[PDB]
mmCIF file of all heavy atoms in Angstrom:
data_model
loop_
_atom_site.group_PDB
_atom_site.id
_atom_site.type_symbol
_atom_site.label_atom_id
_atom_site.label_comp_id
_atom_site.label_asym_id
_atom_site.label_seq_id
_atom_site.Cartn_x
_atom_site.Cartn_y
_atom_site.Cartn_z
ATOM 1 N N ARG A 1 -63.965 -53.179 -4.953
ATOM 2 C CA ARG A 1 -63.726 -52.766 -6.314
ATOM 3 C C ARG A 1 -64.366 -53.686 -7.324
ATOM 4 O O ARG A 1 -64.766 -53.207 -8.482
ATOM 5 C CB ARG A 1 -62.153 -52.712 -6.546
ATOM 6 C CG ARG A 1 -61.777 -52.234 -7.967
ATOM 7 C CD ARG A 1 -60.237 -52.250 -8.143
ATOM 8 N NE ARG A 1 -59.526 -51.486 -7.187
ATOM 9 C CZ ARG A 1 -59.270 -50.212 -7.296
ATOM 10 N NH1 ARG A 1 -59.633 -49.514 -8.364
ATOM 11 N NH2 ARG A 1 -58.628 -49.529 -6.324
ATOM 12 N N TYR A 2 -64.454 -54.973 -7.044
ATOM 13 C CA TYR A 2 -65.011 -55.988 -7.989
ATOM 14 C C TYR A 2 -66.468 -56.325 -7.757
ATOM 15 O O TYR A 2 -66.984 -57.277 -8.395
ATOM 16 C CB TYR A 2 -64.089 -57.216 -7.971
ATOM 17 C CG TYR A 2 -62.717 -57.077 -8.530
ATOM 18 C CD1 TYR A 2 -61.678 -56.466 -7.772
ATOM 19 C CD2 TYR A 2 -62.410 -57.655 -9.771
ATOM 20 C CE1 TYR A 2 -60.408 -56.376 -8.259
ATOM 21 C CE2 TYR A 2 -61.087 -57.451 -10.283
ATOM 22 C CZ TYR A 2 -60.079 -56.898 -9.507
ATOM 23 O OH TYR A 2 -58.778 -56.873 -9.946
ATOM 24 N N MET A 3 -67.132 -55.660 -6.765
ATOM 25 C CA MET A 3 -68.539 -55.953 -6.466
ATOM 26 C C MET A 3 -69.454 -55.547 -7.624
ATOM 27 O O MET A 3 -69.356 -54.451 -8.111
ATOM 28 C CB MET A 3 -69.012 -55.268 -5.156
ATOM 29 C CG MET A 3 -68.362 -55.813 -3.928
ATOM 30 S SD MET A 3 -68.974 -54.834 -2.487
ATOM 31 C CE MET A 3 -68.092 -55.757 -1.138
ATOM 32 N N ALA A 4 -70.383 -56.454 -7.956
ATOM 33 C CA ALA A 4 -71.307 -56.218 -8.943
ATOM 34 C C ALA A 4 -72.330 -55.125 -8.635
ATOM 35 O O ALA A 4 -72.497 -54.854 -7.381
ATOM 36 C CB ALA A 4 -72.098 -57.528 -9.294
ATOM 37 N N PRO A 5 -72.874 -54.427 -9.609
ATOM 38 C CA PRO A 5 -73.834 -53.320 -9.241
ATOM 39 C C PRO A 5 -74.926 -53.743 -8.236
ATOM 40 O O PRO A 5 -75.163 -52.994 -7.344
ATOM 41 C CB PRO A 5 -74.416 -52.931 -10.636
ATOM 42 C CG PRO A 5 -73.439 -53.336 -11.602
ATOM 43 C CD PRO A 5 -72.756 -54.587 -11.094
ATOM 44 N N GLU A 6 -75.449 -54.938 -8.406
ATOM 45 C CA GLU A 6 -76.536 -55.437 -7.487
ATOM 46 C C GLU A 6 -76.014 -55.679 -6.083
ATOM 47 O O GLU A 6 -76.782 -55.780 -5.151
ATOM 48 C CB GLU A 6 -77.332 -56.579 -8.115
ATOM 49 C CG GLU A 6 -76.430 -57.841 -8.351
ATOM 50 C CD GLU A 6 -75.629 -57.924 -9.692
ATOM 51 O OE1 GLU A 6 -75.474 -56.867 -10.372
ATOM 52 O OE2 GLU A 6 -75.143 -59.010 -9.955
ATOM 53 N N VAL A 7 -74.688 -55.950 -5.988
ATOM 54 C CA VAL A 7 -74.078 -56.151 -4.664
ATOM 55 C C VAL A 7 -73.852 -54.780 -4.028
ATOM 56 O O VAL A 7 -74.183 -54.625 -2.813
ATOM 57 C CB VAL A 7 -72.830 -57.050 -4.715
ATOM 58 C CG1 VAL A 7 -72.113 -57.032 -3.400
ATOM 59 C CG2 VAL A 7 -73.201 -58.468 -5.193
ATOM 60 N N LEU A 8 -73.381 -53.820 -4.781
ATOM 61 C CA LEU A 8 -73.134 -52.434 -4.301
ATOM 62 C C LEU A 8 -74.319 -51.710 -3.822
ATOM 63 O O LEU A 8 -74.301 -51.071 -2.759
ATOM 64 C CB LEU A 8 -72.368 -51.614 -5.410
ATOM 65 C CG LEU A 8 -70.955 -52.050 -5.749
ATOM 66 C CD1 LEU A 8 -70.472 -51.354 -7.004
ATOM 67 C CD2 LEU A 8 -69.990 -51.883 -4.584
ATOM 68 N N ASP A 9 -75.434 -51.839 -4.628
ATOM 69 C CA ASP A 9 -76.645 -51.161 -4.184
ATOM 70 C C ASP A 9 -77.645 -52.026 -3.311
ATOM 71 O O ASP A 9 -78.792 -51.556 -2.971
ATOM 72 C CB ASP A 9 -77.405 -50.548 -5.409
ATOM 73 C CG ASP A 9 -78.010 -51.654 -6.362
ATOM 74 O OD1 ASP A 9 -77.859 -52.820 -6.026
ATOM 75 O OD2 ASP A 9 -78.612 -51.251 -7.386
ATOM 76 N N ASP A 10 -77.145 -53.197 -2.961
ATOM 77 C CA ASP A 10 -77.833 -54.218 -2.108
ATOM 78 C C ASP A 10 -79.188 -54.689 -2.637
ATOM 79 O O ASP A 10 -79.978 -55.140 -1.859
ATOM 80 C CB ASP A 10 -77.921 -53.774 -0.642
ATOM 81 C CG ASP A 10 -78.105 -54.865 0.398
ATOM 82 O OD1 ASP A 10 -77.440 -55.943 0.225
ATOM 83 O OD2 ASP A 10 -78.890 -54.667 1.284
ATOM 84 N N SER A 11 -79.400 -54.612 -3.923
ATOM 85 C CA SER A 11 -80.639 -55.148 -4.606
ATOM 86 C C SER A 11 -80.522 -56.649 -4.894
ATOM 87 O O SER A 11 -81.579 -57.281 -5.137
ATOM 88 C CB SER A 11 -80.882 -54.376 -5.891
ATOM 89 O OG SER A 11 -79.807 -54.479 -6.781
ATOM 90 N N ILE A 12 -79.387 -57.303 -4.738
ATOM 91 C CA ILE A 12 -79.206 -58.711 -5.021
ATOM 92 C C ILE A 12 -80.114 -59.545 -4.065
ATOM 93 O O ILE A 12 -80.143 -59.216 -2.898
ATOM 94 C CB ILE A 12 -77.817 -59.129 -4.991
ATOM 95 C CG1 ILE A 12 -77.568 -60.534 -5.593
ATOM 96 C CG2 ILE A 12 -77.112 -58.927 -3.598
ATOM 97 C CD1 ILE A 12 -76.075 -60.896 -5.798
ATOM 98 N N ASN A 13 -80.721 -60.569 -4.596
ATOM 99 C CA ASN A 13 -81.557 -61.472 -3.810
ATOM 100 C C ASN A 13 -80.596 -62.490 -3.290
ATOM 101 O O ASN A 13 -80.239 -63.485 -4.034
ATOM 102 C CB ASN A 13 -82.683 -62.080 -4.581
ATOM 103 C CG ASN A 13 -83.506 -62.993 -3.757
ATOM 104 O OD1 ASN A 13 -83.272 -63.242 -2.573
ATOM 105 N ND2 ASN A 13 -84.555 -63.548 -4.446
ATOM 106 N N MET A 14 -80.194 -62.426 -2.031
ATOM 107 C CA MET A 14 -79.167 -63.375 -1.463
ATOM 108 C C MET A 14 -79.737 -64.777 -1.152
ATOM 109 O O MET A 14 -78.965 -65.676 -0.703
ATOM 110 C CB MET A 14 -78.484 -62.785 -0.226
ATOM 111 C CG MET A 14 -77.357 -61.863 -0.647
ATOM 112 S SD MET A 14 -76.333 -61.184 0.712
ATOM 113 C CE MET A 14 -77.087 -59.666 0.944
ATOM 114 N N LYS A 15 -81.032 -65.024 -1.519
ATOM 115 C CA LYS A 15 -81.612 -66.318 -1.400
ATOM 116 C C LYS A 15 -81.541 -66.987 -2.785
ATOM 117 O O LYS A 15 -81.719 -68.204 -2.883
ATOM 118 C CB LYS A 15 -83.130 -66.160 -0.966
ATOM 119 C CG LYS A 15 -83.282 -65.970 0.531
ATOM 120 C CD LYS A 15 -84.698 -65.570 0.946
ATOM 121 C CE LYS A 15 -85.007 -65.876 2.391
ATOM 122 N NZ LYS A 15 -84.132 -65.188 3.349
ATOM 123 N N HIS A 16 -81.183 -66.201 -3.839
ATOM 124 C CA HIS A 16 -81.132 -66.667 -5.254
ATOM 125 C C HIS A 16 -79.702 -67.043 -5.695
ATOM 126 O O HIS A 16 -78.986 -66.135 -6.152
ATOM 127 C CB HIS A 16 -81.821 -65.580 -6.093
ATOM 128 C CG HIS A 16 -82.024 -66.028 -7.557
ATOM 129 N ND1 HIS A 16 -81.560 -65.175 -8.545
ATOM 130 C CD2 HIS A 16 -82.714 -67.030 -8.067
ATOM 131 C CE1 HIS A 16 -81.987 -65.770 -9.637
ATOM 132 N NE2 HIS A 16 -82.715 -66.867 -9.427
ATOM 133 N N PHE A 17 -79.432 -68.295 -5.648
ATOM 134 C CA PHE A 17 -78.029 -68.721 -6.039
ATOM 135 C C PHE A 17 -77.500 -68.212 -7.346
ATOM 136 O O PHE A 17 -76.339 -67.844 -7.532
ATOM 137 C CB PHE A 17 -77.958 -70.321 -5.895
ATOM 138 C CG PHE A 17 -76.538 -70.761 -6.113
ATOM 139 C CD1 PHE A 17 -75.597 -70.621 -5.081
ATOM 140 C CD2 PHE A 17 -76.073 -71.174 -7.366
ATOM 141 C CE1 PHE A 17 -74.276 -70.945 -5.298
ATOM 142 C CE2 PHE A 17 -74.754 -71.527 -7.588
ATOM 143 C CZ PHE A 17 -73.873 -71.441 -6.521
ATOM 144 N N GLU A 18 -78.386 -68.301 -8.428
ATOM 145 C CA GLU A 18 -78.023 -67.771 -9.752
ATOM 146 C C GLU A 18 -77.607 -66.359 -9.671
ATOM 147 O O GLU A 18 -76.678 -65.964 -10.423
ATOM 148 C CB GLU A 18 -79.256 -67.943 -10.701
ATOM 149 C CG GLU A 18 -78.903 -67.777 -12.186
ATOM 150 C CD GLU A 18 -78.020 -68.904 -12.847
ATOM 151 O OE1 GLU A 18 -78.040 -69.995 -12.267
ATOM 152 O OE2 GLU A 18 -77.411 -68.591 -13.840
ATOM 153 N N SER A 19 -78.106 -65.544 -8.705
ATOM 154 C CA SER A 19 -77.606 -64.166 -8.551
ATOM 155 C C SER A 19 -76.053 -64.139 -8.122
ATOM 156 O O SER A 19 -75.435 -63.232 -8.559
ATOM 157 C CB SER A 19 -78.455 -63.370 -7.512
ATOM 158 O OG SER A 19 -79.672 -63.240 -8.166
ATOM 159 N N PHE A 20 -75.632 -65.118 -7.366
ATOM 160 C CA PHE A 20 -74.171 -65.169 -7.035
ATOM 161 C C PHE A 20 -73.330 -65.538 -8.242
ATOM 162 O O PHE A 20 -72.236 -64.941 -8.309
ATOM 163 C CB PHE A 20 -73.933 -66.082 -5.766
ATOM 164 C CG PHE A 20 -74.473 -65.515 -4.509
ATOM 165 C CD1 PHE A 20 -75.592 -66.023 -3.889
ATOM 166 C CD2 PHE A 20 -73.782 -64.374 -3.910
ATOM 167 C CE1 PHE A 20 -76.072 -65.513 -2.693
ATOM 168 C CE2 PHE A 20 -74.301 -63.880 -2.714
ATOM 169 C CZ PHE A 20 -75.392 -64.422 -2.097
ATOM 170 N N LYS A 21 -73.756 -66.447 -9.065
ATOM 171 C CA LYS A 21 -73.059 -66.792 -10.211
ATOM 172 C C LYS A 21 -72.963 -65.570 -11.151
ATOM 173 O O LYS A 21 -71.877 -65.315 -11.691
ATOM 174 C CB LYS A 21 -73.806 -67.874 -11.088
ATOM 175 C CG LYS A 21 -73.606 -69.315 -10.545
ATOM 176 C CD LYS A 21 -74.801 -70.136 -11.096
ATOM 177 C CE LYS A 21 -74.504 -70.664 -12.544
ATOM 178 N NZ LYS A 21 -75.732 -71.453 -12.911
ATOM 179 N N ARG A 22 -74.045 -64.837 -11.329
ATOM 180 C CA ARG A 22 -74.031 -63.646 -12.197
ATOM 181 C C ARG A 22 -73.044 -62.608 -11.701
ATOM 182 O O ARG A 22 -72.408 -61.872 -12.478
ATOM 183 C CB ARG A 22 -75.431 -63.126 -12.288
ATOM 184 C CG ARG A 22 -76.334 -64.149 -13.119
ATOM 185 C CD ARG A 22 -77.766 -63.856 -12.811
ATOM 186 N NE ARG A 22 -78.617 -64.676 -13.723
ATOM 187 C CZ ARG A 22 -80.020 -64.767 -13.526
ATOM 188 N NH1 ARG A 22 -80.621 -64.024 -12.661
ATOM 189 N NH2 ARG A 22 -80.640 -65.530 -14.357
ATOM 190 N N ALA A 23 -72.969 -62.380 -10.400
ATOM 191 C CA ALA A 23 -72.086 -61.384 -9.759
ATOM 192 C C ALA A 23 -70.569 -61.792 -10.036
ATOM 193 O O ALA A 23 -69.716 -60.943 -10.237
ATOM 194 C CB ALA A 23 -72.330 -61.264 -8.335
ATOM 195 N N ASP A 24 -70.253 -63.120 -10.068
ATOM 196 C CA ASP A 24 -68.932 -63.679 -10.361
ATOM 197 C C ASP A 24 -68.553 -63.273 -11.782
ATOM 198 O O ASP A 24 -67.400 -62.905 -12.036
ATOM 199 C CB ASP A 24 -68.842 -65.128 -10.239
ATOM 200 C CG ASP A 24 -68.614 -65.730 -8.820
ATOM 201 O OD1 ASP A 24 -68.435 -64.966 -7.841
ATOM 202 O OD2 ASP A 24 -68.696 -67.039 -8.662
ATOM 203 N N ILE A 25 -69.565 -63.395 -12.715
ATOM 204 C CA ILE A 25 -69.269 -63.079 -14.178
ATOM 205 C C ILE A 25 -68.922 -61.659 -14.314
ATOM 206 O O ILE A 25 -68.002 -61.347 -15.111
ATOM 207 C CB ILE A 25 -70.567 -63.505 -14.969
ATOM 208 C CG1 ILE A 25 -70.745 -65.027 -14.996
ATOM 209 C CG2 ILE A 25 -70.493 -62.924 -16.410
ATOM 210 C CD1 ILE A 25 -69.583 -65.773 -15.529
ATOM 211 N N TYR A 26 -69.617 -60.718 -13.655
ATOM 212 C CA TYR A 26 -69.305 -59.328 -13.657
ATOM 213 C C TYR A 26 -67.782 -59.117 -13.218
ATOM 214 O O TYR A 26 -67.038 -58.460 -13.869
ATOM 215 C CB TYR A 26 -70.223 -58.520 -12.775
ATOM 216 C CG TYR A 26 -69.685 -57.097 -12.510
ATOM 217 C CD1 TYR A 26 -69.989 -56.013 -13.332
ATOM 218 C CD2 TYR A 26 -68.849 -56.797 -11.434
ATOM 219 C CE1 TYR A 26 -69.544 -54.737 -13.078
ATOM 220 C CE2 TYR A 26 -68.336 -55.545 -11.215
ATOM 221 C CZ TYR A 26 -68.696 -54.520 -12.001
ATOM 222 O OH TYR A 26 -68.209 -53.272 -11.760
ATOM 223 N N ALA A 27 -67.374 -59.768 -12.059
ATOM 224 C CA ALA A 27 -65.979 -59.662 -11.648
ATOM 225 C C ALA A 27 -64.997 -60.301 -12.662
ATOM 226 O O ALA A 27 -63.936 -59.671 -12.924
ATOM 227 C CB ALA A 27 -65.771 -60.236 -10.250
ATOM 228 N N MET A 28 -65.335 -61.395 -13.288
ATOM 229 C CA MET A 28 -64.507 -61.969 -14.296
ATOM 230 C C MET A 28 -64.245 -61.062 -15.472
ATOM 231 O O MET A 28 -63.218 -60.947 -16.081
ATOM 232 C CB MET A 28 -64.995 -63.357 -14.757
ATOM 233 C CG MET A 28 -63.899 -64.030 -15.590
ATOM 234 S SD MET A 28 -64.309 -65.736 -15.995
ATOM 235 C CE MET A 28 -65.502 -65.488 -17.265
ATOM 236 N N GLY A 29 -65.338 -60.255 -15.808
ATOM 237 C CA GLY A 29 -65.256 -59.290 -16.846
ATOM 238 C C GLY A 29 -64.245 -58.222 -16.563
ATOM 239 O O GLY A 29 -63.399 -57.884 -17.457
ATOM 240 N N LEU A 30 -64.107 -57.815 -15.349
ATOM 241 C CA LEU A 30 -63.155 -56.792 -14.909
ATOM 242 C C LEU A 30 -61.710 -57.449 -15.031
ATOM 243 O O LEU A 30 -60.791 -56.723 -15.386
ATOM 244 C CB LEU A 30 -63.389 -56.302 -13.456
ATOM 245 C CG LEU A 30 -64.721 -55.630 -13.221
ATOM 246 C CD1 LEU A 30 -64.943 -55.295 -11.656
ATOM 247 C CD2 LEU A 30 -64.900 -54.340 -13.985
ATOM 248 N N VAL A 31 -61.605 -58.684 -14.650
ATOM 249 C CA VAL A 31 -60.283 -59.392 -14.679
ATOM 250 C C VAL A 31 -59.892 -59.498 -16.184
ATOM 251 O O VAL A 31 -58.677 -59.297 -16.551
ATOM 252 C CB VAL A 31 -60.408 -60.862 -14.105
ATOM 253 C CG1 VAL A 31 -59.174 -61.574 -14.404
ATOM 254 C CG2 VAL A 31 -60.650 -60.749 -12.569
ATOM 255 N N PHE A 32 -60.843 -59.802 -17.088
ATOM 256 C CA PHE A 32 -60.507 -59.848 -18.568
ATOM 257 C C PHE A 32 -59.965 -58.498 -19.104
ATOM 258 O O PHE A 32 -59.006 -58.504 -19.924
ATOM 259 C CB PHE A 32 -61.728 -60.262 -19.381
ATOM 260 C CG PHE A 32 -62.021 -61.764 -19.433
ATOM 261 C CD1 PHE A 32 -61.431 -62.642 -18.441
ATOM 262 C CD2 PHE A 32 -62.833 -62.299 -20.387
ATOM 263 C CE1 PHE A 32 -61.670 -63.972 -18.428
ATOM 264 C CE2 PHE A 32 -63.154 -63.721 -20.321
ATOM 265 C CZ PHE A 32 -62.593 -64.491 -19.342
ATOM 266 N N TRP A 33 -60.536 -57.402 -18.622
ATOM 267 C CA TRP A 33 -60.142 -55.975 -18.944
ATOM 268 C C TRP A 33 -58.672 -55.813 -18.505
ATOM 269 O O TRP A 33 -57.826 -55.337 -19.262
ATOM 270 C CB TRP A 33 -61.090 -54.993 -18.327
ATOM 271 C CG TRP A 33 -60.648 -53.597 -18.593
ATOM 272 C CD1 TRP A 33 -61.065 -52.755 -19.596
ATOM 273 C CD2 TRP A 33 -59.831 -52.737 -17.688
ATOM 274 N NE1 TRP A 33 -60.469 -51.503 -19.446
ATOM 275 C CE2 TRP A 33 -59.778 -51.495 -18.302
ATOM 276 C CE3 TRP A 33 -59.150 -52.971 -16.479
ATOM 277 C CZ2 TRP A 33 -59.053 -50.343 -17.626
ATOM 278 C CZ3 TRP A 33 -58.457 -51.912 -15.847
ATOM 279 C CH2 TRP A 33 -58.439 -50.711 -16.456
ATOM 280 N N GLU A 34 -58.350 -56.299 -17.230
ATOM 281 C CA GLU A 34 -56.991 -56.224 -16.782
ATOM 282 C C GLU A 34 -56.030 -56.962 -17.653
ATOM 283 O O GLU A 34 -54.853 -56.434 -17.854
ATOM 284 C CB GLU A 34 -56.864 -56.857 -15.295
ATOM 285 C CG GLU A 34 -57.533 -55.999 -14.255
ATOM 286 C CD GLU A 34 -57.524 -56.686 -12.912
ATOM 287 O OE1 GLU A 34 -56.414 -56.748 -12.316
ATOM 288 O OE2 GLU A 34 -58.529 -57.256 -12.464
ATOM 289 N N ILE A 35 -56.331 -58.098 -18.163
ATOM 290 C CA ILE A 35 -55.451 -58.941 -19.041
ATOM 291 C C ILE A 35 -55.300 -58.300 -20.338
ATOM 292 O O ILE A 35 -54.210 -58.216 -20.791
ATOM 293 C CB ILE A 35 -56.037 -60.370 -19.221
ATOM 294 C CG1 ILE A 35 -56.226 -61.130 -17.897
ATOM 295 C CG2 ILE A 35 -55.164 -61.179 -20.213
ATOM 296 C CD1 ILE A 35 -57.152 -62.358 -18.048
ATOM 297 N N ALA A 36 -56.382 -57.918 -20.998
ATOM 298 C CA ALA A 36 -56.368 -57.369 -22.358
ATOM 299 C C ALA A 36 -55.508 -56.061 -22.390
ATOM 300 O O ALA A 36 -54.802 -55.801 -23.389
ATOM 301 C CB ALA A 36 -57.764 -56.964 -22.777
ATOM 302 N N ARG A 37 -55.437 -55.200 -21.316
ATOM 303 C CA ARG A 37 -54.627 -54.062 -21.275
ATOM 304 C C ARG A 37 -53.181 -54.425 -21.531
ATOM 305 O O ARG A 37 -52.293 -53.645 -21.990
ATOM 306 C CB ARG A 37 -54.705 -53.277 -19.958
ATOM 307 C CG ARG A 37 -56.010 -52.510 -19.867
ATOM 308 C CD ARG A 37 -55.994 -51.866 -18.491
ATOM 309 N NE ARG A 37 -54.915 -50.930 -18.236
ATOM 310 C CZ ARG A 37 -55.000 -49.632 -18.620
ATOM 311 N NH1 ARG A 37 -56.080 -49.159 -19.139
ATOM 312 N NH2 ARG A 37 -54.025 -48.866 -18.288
ATOM 313 N N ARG A 38 -52.753 -55.619 -21.017
ATOM 314 C CA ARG A 38 -51.381 -56.098 -21.056
ATOM 315 C C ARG A 38 -51.073 -56.867 -22.284
ATOM 316 O O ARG A 38 -49.837 -57.262 -22.448
ATOM 317 C CB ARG A 38 -51.011 -56.833 -19.786
ATOM 318 C CG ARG A 38 -51.337 -55.925 -18.505
ATOM 319 C CD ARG A 38 -50.453 -54.708 -18.369
ATOM 320 N NE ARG A 38 -49.075 -55.111 -17.980
ATOM 321 C CZ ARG A 38 -47.913 -54.404 -18.303
ATOM 322 N NH1 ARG A 38 -47.963 -53.306 -19.012
ATOM 323 N NH2 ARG A 38 -46.713 -54.886 -17.847
ATOM 324 N N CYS A 39 -52.009 -56.952 -23.246
ATOM 325 C CA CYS A 39 -51.713 -57.685 -24.471
ATOM 326 C C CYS A 39 -50.990 -56.754 -25.405
ATOM 327 O O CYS A 39 -51.448 -55.680 -25.732
ATOM 328 C CB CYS A 39 -53.048 -58.098 -25.104
ATOM 329 S SG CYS A 39 -52.806 -59.006 -26.691
ATOM 330 N N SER A 40 -49.745 -57.194 -25.813
ATOM 331 C CA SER A 40 -48.796 -56.480 -26.575
ATOM 332 C C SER A 40 -48.770 -56.871 -28.015
ATOM 333 O O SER A 40 -48.433 -57.945 -28.361
ATOM 334 C CB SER A 40 -47.425 -56.515 -26.000
ATOM 335 O OG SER A 40 -46.576 -55.421 -26.318
ATOM 336 N N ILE A 41 -49.294 -56.025 -28.946
ATOM 337 C CA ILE A 41 -49.392 -56.212 -30.417
ATOM 338 C C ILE A 41 -48.650 -55.076 -31.102
ATOM 339 O O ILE A 41 -49.092 -53.905 -30.929
ATOM 340 C CB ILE A 41 -50.922 -56.313 -30.803
ATOM 341 C CG1 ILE A 41 -51.636 -57.388 -30.193
ATOM 342 C CG2 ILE A 41 -50.969 -56.373 -32.365
ATOM 343 C CD1 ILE A 41 -53.050 -57.152 -29.879
ATOM 344 N N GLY A 42 -47.639 -55.425 -31.883
ATOM 345 C CA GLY A 42 -46.843 -54.457 -32.607
ATOM 346 C C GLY A 42 -46.261 -53.428 -31.624
ATOM 347 O O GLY A 42 -46.181 -52.296 -31.949
ATOM 348 N N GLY A 43 -45.922 -53.928 -30.401
ATOM 349 C CA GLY A 43 -45.308 -53.131 -29.274
ATOM 350 C C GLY A 43 -46.322 -52.245 -28.602
ATOM 351 O O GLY A 43 -45.888 -51.519 -27.726
ATOM 352 N N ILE A 44 -47.659 -52.293 -28.975
ATOM 353 C CA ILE A 44 -48.665 -51.492 -28.402
ATOM 354 C C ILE A 44 -49.324 -52.194 -27.215
ATOM 355 O O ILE A 44 -49.838 -53.322 -27.421
ATOM 356 C CB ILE A 44 -49.703 -50.962 -29.444
ATOM 357 C CG1 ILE A 44 -49.104 -50.317 -30.711
ATOM 358 C CG2 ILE A 44 -50.789 -50.072 -28.777
ATOM 359 C CD1 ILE A 44 -48.317 -48.998 -30.447
ATOM 360 N N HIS A 45 -49.384 -51.492 -26.017
ATOM 361 C CA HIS A 45 -50.056 -52.002 -24.836
ATOM 362 C C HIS A 45 -50.265 -50.931 -23.778
ATOM 363 O O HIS A 45 -49.677 -49.833 -23.900
ATOM 364 C CB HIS A 45 -49.289 -53.230 -24.218
ATOM 365 C CG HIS A 45 -47.947 -52.906 -23.754
ATOM 366 N ND1 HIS A 45 -46.852 -53.211 -24.590
ATOM 367 C CD2 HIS A 45 -47.516 -52.262 -22.637
ATOM 368 C CE1 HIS A 45 -45.779 -52.815 -23.893
ATOM 369 N NE2 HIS A 45 -46.144 -52.217 -22.712
#
């Protein structure tokens, strides 16, 4: 569910360390979306 597009389509260069850092950022983005949905402002969430 959290795999980056380049991991899903297998285009990622697994010899390129910076590519693994970038794939982690994509997954952190999905985690931020999970948190923001649960942010309650004026009773709205």
